Amino acid sequence: GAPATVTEQGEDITSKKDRGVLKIVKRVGNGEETPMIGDKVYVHYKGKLSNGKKFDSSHDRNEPFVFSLGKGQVIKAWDIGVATMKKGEIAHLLIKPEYAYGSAGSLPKIPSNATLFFEIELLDFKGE
Numbered sequence: 030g031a032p033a034t035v036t037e038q039g040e041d042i043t044s045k046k047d048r049g050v051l052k053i054v055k056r057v058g059n060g061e062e063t064p065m066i067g068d069k070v071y072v073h074y075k076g077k078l079s080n081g082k083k084f085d086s087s088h089d090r091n092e093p094f095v096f097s098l099g100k101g102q103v104i105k106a107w108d109i110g111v112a113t114m115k116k117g118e119i120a121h122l123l124i125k126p127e128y129a130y131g132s133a134g135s136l137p138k139i140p141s142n143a144t145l146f147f148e149i150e151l152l153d154f155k156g157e
């Protein structure tokens with residue numbers, strides 16, 4: 030399925046080149062610009078655990094998730110990954126725990142040592 034495919038066929042987008050965050054672009058977005066640090070980013074997403082469980086989805090809430098890019102409001106992989114996306118892009122990310130919730134996990138939904146899969150759509154970015 031899609032998690033296996035990004036694991037086996039994704040590109041390493043980390044600065045360290047440690048394969049901690051792999052990406053596939055599913056739908057090419059608009060032009061060349063990506064958001065900058067501090068921008069208000071609007072995304073839709075779905076997240077899955079390695080046991081197959083969908084653990085979260087913004088689509089199911091009928092509202093995007095909004096955050097300020099690069100300010101540590103989200104897991105490291107999101108700050109890294111969303112920064113690579115163009116407006117309108119849809120991407121898959123495969124994230125090792127070191128770029129997510131690590132050995133702690135995040136109770137109740139995220140186990141210890143969890144590799145995470147996301148599908149993310151960048152709706153809009155604005156501001157700083």
Ligand SMILES: C=C[C@H]1CN(Cc2ccccn2)C(=O)[C@@H]2CCC[C@H]1N2[S@@](=N)(=O)c1cc(Cl)cc(Cl)c1
Pocket residue numbers: 076084085094102103104107135136138139
């Ligand atoms: C909807 C909440 C976000 C939670 N966070 C930030 C955060 C804040 C506080 C505690 C744990 N994580 C995050 O960094 C990431 C990425 C942005 C979307 C979503 N998560 S998430 N989908 O991984 C998620 C979803 C859910 Cl239901 C629980 C957790 Cl602990 C994490």
